[PDB]
Design an enzyme around this catalytic site. Structure first.
Site, PDB file in Angstrom:
ATOM      1  N   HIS A 289      80.157  62.276  28.613  1.00  0.00           N
ATOM      2  CA  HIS A 289      80.802  63.541  28.946  1.00  0.00           C
ATOM      3  C   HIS A 289      80.562  64.597  27.880  1.00  0.00           C
ATOM      4  O   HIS A 289      80.533  65.791  28.193  1.00  0.00           O
ATOM      5  CB  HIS A 289      82.298  63.327  29.159  1.00  0.00           C
ATOM      6  CG  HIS A 289      82.628  62.625  30.438  1.00  0.00           C
ATOM      7  ND1 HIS A 289      83.874  62.690  31.023  1.00  0.00           N
ATOM      8  CD2 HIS A 289      81.871  61.853  31.253  1.00  0.00           C
ATOM      9  CE1 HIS A 289      83.872  61.983  32.138  1.00  0.00           C
ATOM     10  NE2 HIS A 289      82.668  61.465  32.301  1.00  0.00           N
TER      11      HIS A 289
ATOM     12  N   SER B  84      75.690  64.590  32.380  1.00  0.00           N
ATOM     13  CA  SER B  84      74.995  63.616  33.209  1.00  0.00           C
ATOM     14  C   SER B  84      73.669  64.180  33.711  1.00  0.00           C
ATOM     15  O   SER B  84      73.395  65.378  33.625  1.00  0.00           O
ATOM     16  CB  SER B  84      75.876  63.176  34.381  1.00  0.00           C
ATOM     17  OG  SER B  84      76.467  64.288  35.020  1.00  0.00           O
TER      18      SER B  84
ATOM     19  N   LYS C 268      82.834  60.473  47.616  1.00  0.00           N
ATOM     20  CA  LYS C 268      81.594  59.699  47.611  1.00  0.00           C
ATOM     21  C   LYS C 268      81.778  58.355  46.909  1.00  0.00           C
ATOM     22  O   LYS C 268      81.272  57.326  47.376  1.00  0.00           O
ATOM     23  CB  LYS C 268      80.481  60.505  46.949  1.00  0.00           C
ATOM     24  CG  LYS C 268      79.090  60.100  47.380  1.00  0.00           C
ATOM     25  CD  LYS C 268      78.059  61.114  46.928  1.00  0.00           C
ATOM     26  CE  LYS C 268      76.671  60.719  47.386  1.00  0.00           C
ATOM     27  NZ  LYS C 268      75.658  61.740  47.013  1.00  0.00           N
ATOM     28  N   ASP C 269      82.542  58.332  45.814  1.00  0.00           N
ATOM     29  CA  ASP C 269      82.819  57.066  45.151  1.00  0.00           C
ATOM     30  C   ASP C 269      83.820  56.215  45.923  1.00  0.00           C
ATOM     31  O   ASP C 269      83.754  54.992  45.829  1.00  0.00           O
ATOM     32  CB  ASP C 269      83.304  57.304  43.723  1.00  0.00           C
ATOM     33  CG  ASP C 269      82.209  57.843  42.819  1.00  0.00           C
ATOM     34  OD1 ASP C 269      81.024  57.536  43.066  1.00  0.00           O
ATOM     35  OD2 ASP C 269      82.533  58.573  41.860  1.00  0.00           O
TER      36      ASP C 269
ATOM     37  N   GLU D 193      73.469  30.430  35.935  1.00  0.00           N
ATOM     38  CA  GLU D 193      73.604  31.225  37.145  1.00  0.00           C
ATOM     39  C   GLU D 193      72.490  32.262  37.251  1.00  0.00           C
ATOM     40  O   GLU D 193      71.724  32.497  36.313  1.00  0.00           O
ATOM     41  CB  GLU D 193      74.983  31.884  37.203  1.00  0.00           C
ATOM     42  CG  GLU D 193      76.136  30.970  37.664  1.00  0.00           C
ATOM     43  CD  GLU D 193      75.762  29.936  38.738  1.00  0.00           C
ATOM     44  OE1 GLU D 193      76.228  28.787  38.632  1.00  0.00           O
ATOM     45  OE2 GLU D 193      75.129  30.285  39.763  1.00  0.00           O
TER      46      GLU D 193
HETATM   47  C1  HEM Z   1      79.236  47.306  31.735  1.00  0.00           C
HETATM   48  C2  HEM Z   1      79.385  48.095  32.792  1.00  0.00           C
HETATM   49  C3  HEM Z   1      79.111  49.547  32.782  1.00  0.00           C
HETATM   50  C4  HEM Z   1      79.987  50.504  33.174  1.00  0.00           C
HETATM   51  C5  HEM Z   1      81.393  50.281  33.662  1.00  0.00           C
HETATM   52  C6  HEM Z   1      79.345  51.752  33.036  1.00  0.00           C
HETATM   53  C7  HEM Z   1      80.010  52.926  33.381  1.00  0.00           C
HETATM   54  C8  HEM Z   1      79.312  54.093  33.577  1.00  0.00           C
HETATM   55  C9  HEM Z   1      79.793  55.245  34.217  1.00  0.00           C
HETATM   56  C10 HEM Z   1      81.158  55.414  34.830  1.00  0.00           C
HETATM   57  C11 HEM Z   1      78.802  56.169  34.190  1.00  0.00           C
HETATM   58  C12 HEM Z   1      78.893  57.555  34.770  1.00  0.00           C
HETATM   59  C13 HEM Z   1      78.542  57.557  36.262  1.00  0.00           C
HETATM   60  C14 HEM Z   1      77.053  57.493  36.470  1.00  0.00           C
HETATM   61  O1  HEM Z   1      76.377  58.477  36.294  1.00  0.00           O
HETATM   62  O2  HEM Z   1      76.476  56.347  36.857  1.00  0.00           O
HETATM   63  C15 HEM Z   1      77.693  55.600  33.526  1.00  0.00           C
HETATM   64  C16 HEM Z   1      76.502  56.262  33.296  1.00  0.00           C
HETATM   65  C17 HEM Z   1      75.507  55.752  32.466  1.00  0.00           C
HETATM   66  N1  HEM Z   1      75.431  54.529  31.940  1.00  0.00           N
HETATM   67 FE1  HEM Z   1      76.788  53.080  32.210  1.00  0.00          FE
HETATM   68  N2  HEM Z   1      78.098  51.589  32.571  1.00  0.00           N
HETATM   69  C18 HEM Z   1      77.874  50.274  32.400  1.00  0.00           C
HETATM   70  C19 HEM Z   1      76.719  49.642  31.948  1.00  0.00           C
HETATM   71  C20 HEM Z   1      75.683  50.361  31.390  1.00  0.00           C
HETATM   72  C21 HEM Z   1      74.583  49.805  30.751  1.00  0.00           C
HETATM   73  C22 HEM Z   1      74.368  48.330  30.567  1.00  0.00           C
HETATM   74  C23 HEM Z   1      73.772  50.850  30.345  1.00  0.00           C
HETATM   75  C24 HEM Z   1      72.503  50.747  29.606  1.00  0.00           C
HETATM   76  C25 HEM Z   1      71.398  50.315  30.198  1.00  0.00           C
HETATM   77  C26 HEM Z   1      74.394  52.058  30.765  1.00  0.00           C
HETATM   78  C27 HEM Z   1      73.873  53.309  30.525  1.00  0.00           C
HETATM   79  C28 HEM Z   1      74.317  54.426  31.223  1.00  0.00           C
HETATM   80  C29 HEM Z   1      73.598  55.697  31.263  1.00  0.00           C
HETATM   81  C30 HEM Z   1      72.295  56.008  30.579  1.00  0.00           C
HETATM   82  C31 HEM Z   1      74.331  56.518  32.038  1.00  0.00           C
HETATM   83  C32 HEM Z   1      74.008  57.945  32.377  1.00  0.00           C
HETATM   84  C33 HEM Z   1      73.167  58.021  33.641  1.00  0.00           C
HETATM   85  C34 HEM Z   1      73.373  59.378  34.247  1.00  0.00           C
HETATM   86  O3  HEM Z   1      74.610  59.878  34.354  1.00  0.00           O
HETATM   87  O4  HEM Z   1      72.427  60.015  34.634  1.00  0.00           O
HETATM   88  N3  HEM Z   1      75.561  51.721  31.410  1.00  0.00           N
HETATM   89  N4  HEM Z   1      78.037  54.321  33.157  1.00  0.00           N
END
Ligand code: HEM
Ligand SMILES: CCCCCCCCCCCCCCCCCC(=O)OC[C@H](COP(=O)([O-])OCC(O)COP(=O)([O-])OC[C@@H](COC(=O)CCCCCCCCCCCCCCCCC)OC(=O)CCCCCCCCCCCCCCCCC)OC(=O)CCCCCCCCCCCCCCCCC
Ligand SMILES: CCCCCCCCCCCCCCCCCC(=O)OC[C@H](COP(=O)(O)OCCN)OC(=O)CCCCCCCCCCCCCCCCC
Ligand SMILES: CCCCCCCCCCCCCCCCCC(=O)OC[C@H](COP(=O)(O)OCCN)OC(=O)CCCCCCCCCCCCCCCCC
Ligand code: HEM
Lengths: 53, 380, 72, 60, 267, 101
Positions: free
Chosen positions: B201, B205, B227-228, B271
């Protein structure tokens, strides 16, 4: 409610908000009866009481 | 008077995060997935809490307590199979979320990416210990295999593994401490996810085009909220048709036997979300080298920000690197298939070629393709 | 931080109320050609990796079932 | 004489409190009717297999 | 040729009123109008009836983003009832409750209108003003404010709240204040021969007659708080408005937030 | 020869941003050098770039493209950010070689 709500404008505001508060209390009562599944109210219904719930 | 949404010190955070957050208008359904992950996380916690209300971490009364949950607790079978299948669906959302981050160039947010890699390590450890927890045959033998390959480390591996074990083998000390760690780790994951959202934030994004999205931005409410909700309901559809119609298509039948140290199973595998890692491990004929390759596989996923040699962020306008990306995804599918196979012909050579191509596509061929399209578009 | 994200000059946007317009305006008739257009744009980049690894999966299964035969 | 959604909106959906009241009333009617229909369908799929279909040869 | 066609189609006696105000006797004016305006060619030459079809109101929004302008103007309006609807009078009282404000007002914090008081307390708007434009069977009933960009959404919120207050919690004190304001404005507007002549011409063209001022007094007098909140719930509550914005209007929200601001979940 | 130009045109059509009305120089991921290059742009080219990016985002939201007559052709694809970007890279390299000594 010490002195500043002792006025006619506030009483007519409360009188305006009686039906909305009563409808919301009815919403809460029906939601409580449906959620807790109370037998003492749902035994006097035409349709729900067939399941005894 | 005043605006209570924007001036209250607690409601200001929710207003800045989920209500009046500026979001790109053109983000696709893949942008649902991470939010689904968070929902799936709390779902796991909720189910886990009720699975903590009838489970006893003791080798005499672990399997019997699990059967007591399945048979005697009212809808305990539902909550247990929701916990297991929601763990599988949590990893499904994890792989799709990481694949979105890899494809659309979201790894340029370096602190958010590395924090996410830390979250990935934590959830993999949580799922491994949770799978050890019901104390079946495959739980005990998978814990034995993972701790033995941890003991392959020279001169500190033996001490570290007998200190992780609490003994000379996997016993009730290991079971109790795995219950404690599997309990406590998702709250660390939740706090780390709060930090993850904080960094996102404060950096904003990303759109699928990779361009600057500040020209067309919309509030999170009421577009991406609904949407979510639709994505949450689809995720509930898949989770409920997995828990109510096929409870054991992803599970292991040998986990339904009590744990026996005297009897070893004919085939030992983890798994399905560990199977590509196991196939990468099984290819290299060196146990220290295999553990080194596993940790550096997840670390070159973490190192992917430093291999970006292209002037365009997303892969929307980069078809050669798109082709290489889908070769990488299909190679991950191949490694997942090989990881569930024994070490027989022709799986060794296929697994070795798969791991070599996986490391070559991640490390070598993708920056080469980026430079090739940079030259080919007259960019440099 | 609305109001200071960017600077846009001379752009006019027209929008309708959601209550004055259809939810699904020509849903199938202009949804099917767009779906096949996106399909035509993306299958030549997406599908042949999956075709190739289906071939590898079938060949590996065939070699595994053949390798456990008796003769010789 | 307007359409039934017009008078339905003007009497039921215009105020939020009676909107929630009719959501609750329709929720309890819907849960009763939907449980009736779902047990009817699940009974219709499975003649002769459930316990309630065979608890007369043994109950006595 | 098109101007000649427009003159032949529109400049006719049944769509023409000769109004006089001041030191004018009706007999001399009638004699001069009979001497001069006797021939106007009131025949339909083309023998085609010119009608007035009703206009369709459209809940929509237009936004003209241009960030080099120093101030932003936003107008939000719903559909009006028309010229011949008596409820317009009640709506006038409603506008008199909301009122108007400009930055050069000498009052300050102690203005009677809550919107103007919160706007001068929070330094929100440069100005706002309410309007009830009327046409045949239709019209635009709403508000217009100019402000800086950083205040826009906040101002919208407060304005919407005021509208919903008139739909839900209109008490007799501000109803009496709006009645007195409408009395003073509607009588003191007709000060001079020019606004009296304008009122005569527009009244004979719209209502078909000149409404006497005591009739306006009798129509204002019957307005109490119950029918004012009834008319406000008829015309403002849960309606789809029209929004026009010009200037730095980035913080001006989508149509969905403004559409959600037209109803209260608590009511 | 001309074969490389035709094959570049085929790849330009295969990239797909020209179907959104974009240009090549709009597709640059904005680093600090690209940000200074945009900051040095004249106002008309800046407004055209902002409208093109906004239209591309509006089309990508609806999962649609422009009609084939409105596609950006390979001939009139004017490279407007290249001289500003070249001077920005040259000044940054001058600062770099001063700081390395
Ligand atoms: C463990 C569970 C995870 C949760 C709960 C989580 C949660 C979130 C949420 C709520 C967002 C914002 C919504 C979205 O744009 O998709 C987000 C974005 C993002 N997450 Fe995660 N995430 C997780 C795992 C990961 C992992 C493993 C990575 C690294 C590979 C990661 C990297 C990112 C990135 C780079 C964004 C920004 C993408 C964008 O908004 O364009 N996340 N994540
Ligand atoms: C060929 C078959 C028929 C195709 C067809 O009719 O296409 C019409 C139409 C064609 O799309 P279009 O022409 O681009 O215009 C629609 C717009 O794009 C706007 O529509 P859209 O495509 O953006 O839809 C929003 C999107 C939003 O996506 C989500 O909310 C999903 C988020 C991810 C969920 C992941 C769950 C976990 C998965 C694990 C694996 O919804 C979906 O992806 C599916 C929604 C299904 C709702 C329930 C239908 C019964 O297809 C759709 O709208 C898609 C849904 C079709 C049903
Ligand atoms: C998968 C099924 C096929 C999905 C598909 O059709 O993808 C095509 C889509 C193209 O999207 P794009 O080119 O950006 O847009 C075209 C016009 N809008 O491309 C996409 O939507 C790509 C985004 C999703 C990428 C992830 C898919 C694979 C999931 C597993 C990834 C694992 C990554 C490594 C994790 C462990 C390390
Ligand atoms: C022609 C259509 C005929 C049928 C008509 C019906 C309509 C179908 C769709 C028509 C589409 C028309 C064109 C519009 C789409 C955009 C252009 C396109 O996709 O072209 C095809 C593409 C060309 O390549 P492109 O990416 O454009 O550019 C590369 C630079 N020359 O080509 C490709 O991407 C080809 C990719 C081939 C990949 C082969 C990979 C082989 C090796 C795989 C190994 C994987 C597993 C490894 C495992 C190791 C361990 C065992
Ligand atoms: C703090 C929250 C959590 C608690 C209290 C918790 C508790 C438990 C308990 C008591 C069990 C054993 C019950 C059984 O399986 O019969 C279990 C199993 C398991 N948990 Fe969790 N858990 C939590 C979060 C998670 C998370 C976040 C994941 C990963 C997505 C996870 C993955 C698993 C898995 C894979 C199993 C094995 C299921 C099986 O028997 O097949 N748990 N958990």
């Amino acid at each position: 409610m010490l002195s500043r709500f002792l006025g006619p404008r506030y009483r007519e505001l409360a009188r305006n908000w009686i039906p909305t508060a009563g409808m919301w209390g009815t919403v809460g009562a029906v939601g409580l009866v449906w959620a807790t599944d109370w037998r003492l109210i749902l035994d006097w219904v035409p349709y729900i009481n067939g399941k005894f719930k | 008077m005043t605006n209570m949404r924007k001036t209250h010190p607690l409601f200001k955070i929710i207003n800045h995060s989920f209500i009046d957050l500026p979001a790109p208008s053109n983000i696709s359904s893949w942008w649902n997935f991470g939010s689904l992950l968070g929902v799936c996380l709390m779902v796991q916690i909720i189910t886990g809490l009720f699975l903590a209300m009838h489970y006893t971490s003791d080798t005499m009364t672990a399997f019997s307590s699990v059967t007591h949950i399945c048979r005697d607790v009212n809808y305990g079978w539902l909550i247990r199979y929701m916990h297991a299948n929601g763990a599988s669906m949590f990893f499904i959302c994890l792989f799709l979320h990481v694949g979105r981050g890899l494809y659309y160039g979201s790894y340029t947010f370096m602190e958010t990416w590395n924090i996410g890699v830390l979250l990935l390590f934590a959830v993999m450890a949580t799922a491994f210990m949770g799978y050890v927890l019901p104390w079946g045959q495959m739980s005990f033998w998978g814990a034995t295999v993972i701790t033995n390959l941890l003991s392959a480390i020279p001169y500190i591996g033996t001490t570290l593994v007998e200190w992780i074990w609490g003994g000379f083998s996997v016993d009730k000390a290991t079971l109790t401490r795995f219950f404690a760690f599997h309990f406590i780790l998702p709250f660390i994951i939740a706090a780390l996810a709060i930090v993850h959202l904080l960094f996102l934030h404060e950096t904003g994004s990303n759109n699928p085009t990779g361009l600057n999205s500040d020209a067309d931005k919309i509030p999170f409410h009421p577009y991406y909220t609904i949407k979510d909700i639709l994505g949450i309901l689809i995720m509930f559809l898949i989770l409920m048709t997995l828990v109510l119609f096929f409870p054991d298509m992803l599970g292991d039948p040998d986990n339904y036997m009590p744990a026996n140290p005297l009897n070893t199973p004919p085939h030992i595998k983890p798994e399905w979300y560990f199977l590509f890692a196991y196939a990468i491990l099984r290819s290299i004929p060196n146990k220290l080298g295999g553990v080194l390759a596993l940790i550096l596989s997840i670390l070159i996923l973490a190192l992917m920000p430093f291999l970006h040699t292209s002037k365009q962020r997303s892969l929307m306008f980069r078809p050669i690197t798109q082709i290489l990306y889908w070769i990488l995804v299909a190679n991950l599918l191949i490694l997942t298939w090989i990881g569930g196979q024994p070490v027989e012909h022709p799986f060794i050579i296929i697994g070795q070629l798969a791991s070599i191509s996986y490391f070559s596509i991640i490390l070598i061929l993708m920056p080469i393709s980026g430079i090739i399209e940079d030259k080919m578009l007259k960019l440099y | 931080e609305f109001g200071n994200l960017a600077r846009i000059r001379h752009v006019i946007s027209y929008s309708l109320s959601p209550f004055e317009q259809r939810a699904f305006p020509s849903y199938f008739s202009k949804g099917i050609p767009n779906v096949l257009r996106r399909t035509r744009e993306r299958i030549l980049r997406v599908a042949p990796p999956f075709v190739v690894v289906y071939l590898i999966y079938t060949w590996g299964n065939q070699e595994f079932e053949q390798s456990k035969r008796k003769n010789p | 004489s307007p359409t039934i959604p017009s008078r339905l909106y003007s009497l039921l959906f215009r105020r939020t409190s009676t909107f929630a009241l009719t959501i609750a009333v329709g929720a309890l009617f819907f849960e009763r009717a939907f449980d009736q229909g779902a047990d009817a369908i699940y009974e219709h799929i499975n003649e002769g297999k459930l316990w309630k279909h065979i608890k007369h040869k043994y109950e006595n | 040729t098109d101007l000649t066609d427009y003159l032949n189609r529109h400049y006719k006696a049944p769509r023409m009123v000769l109004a006089a105000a001041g030191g004018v006797e009706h007999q001399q004016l009638l004699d001069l109008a009979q001497k001069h305006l006797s021939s106007v060619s009131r025949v339909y030459e083309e023998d085609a009836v010119p009608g007035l079809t009703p206009c369709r109101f459209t809940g929509s929004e237009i936004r003209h983003r241009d960030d080099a302008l120093p101030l932003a103007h936003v107008a939000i309006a719903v559909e009006g009832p028309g010229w011949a609807n008596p409820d317009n009078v009640t709506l006038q009282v409603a506008n008199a409750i909301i009122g108007h404000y400009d930055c050069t007002y000498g009052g300050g914090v102690h203005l009677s209108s809550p919107l103007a008081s919160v706007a001068v307390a929070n330094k929100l708007c440069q100005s706002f003003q309410t309007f009830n434009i009327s046409y045949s069977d239709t019209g635009l009933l709403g508000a217009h404010f100019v402000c800086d960009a950083m205040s826009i959404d906040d101002m919208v919120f407060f304005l919407q709240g005021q509208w919903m207050r008139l739909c839900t919690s209109a008490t007799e004190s501000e109803v009496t204040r709006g009645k007195n304001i409408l009395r003073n404005a509607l009588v003191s507007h007709l000060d001079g021969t020019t606004p009296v002549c304008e009122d005569i011409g527009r009244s004979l063209l719209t209502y078909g007659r000149r409404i006497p001022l005591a009739e306006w007094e009798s129509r204002i007098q019957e307005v109490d708080a119950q029918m004012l909140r009834d008319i406000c719930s008829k015309y403002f509550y849960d309606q789809c408005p029209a929004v026009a914005g010009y200037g730095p209007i980035e913080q001006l929200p989508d149509y969905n937030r403004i559409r959600s601001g037209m109803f209260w979940l608590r009511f | 020869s001309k074969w490389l130009d035709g094959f570049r045109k085929w790849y330009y059509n295969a990239a797909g941003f020209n179907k959104l009305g974009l240009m090549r120089d709009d597709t640059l991921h904005e680093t600090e050098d690209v940000k200074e290059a945009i900051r040095r742009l004249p106002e008309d080219l800046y407004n055209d770039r902002m409208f093109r990016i906004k239209r591309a985002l509006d089309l990508t939201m609806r999962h649609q493209i422009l009609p084939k007559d409105q596609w950006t052709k390979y001939e009139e694809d004017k490279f407007y950010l290249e001289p500003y970007l070249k001077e920005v890279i040259r000044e940054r390299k001058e600062r770099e070689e001063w700081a390395k000594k």
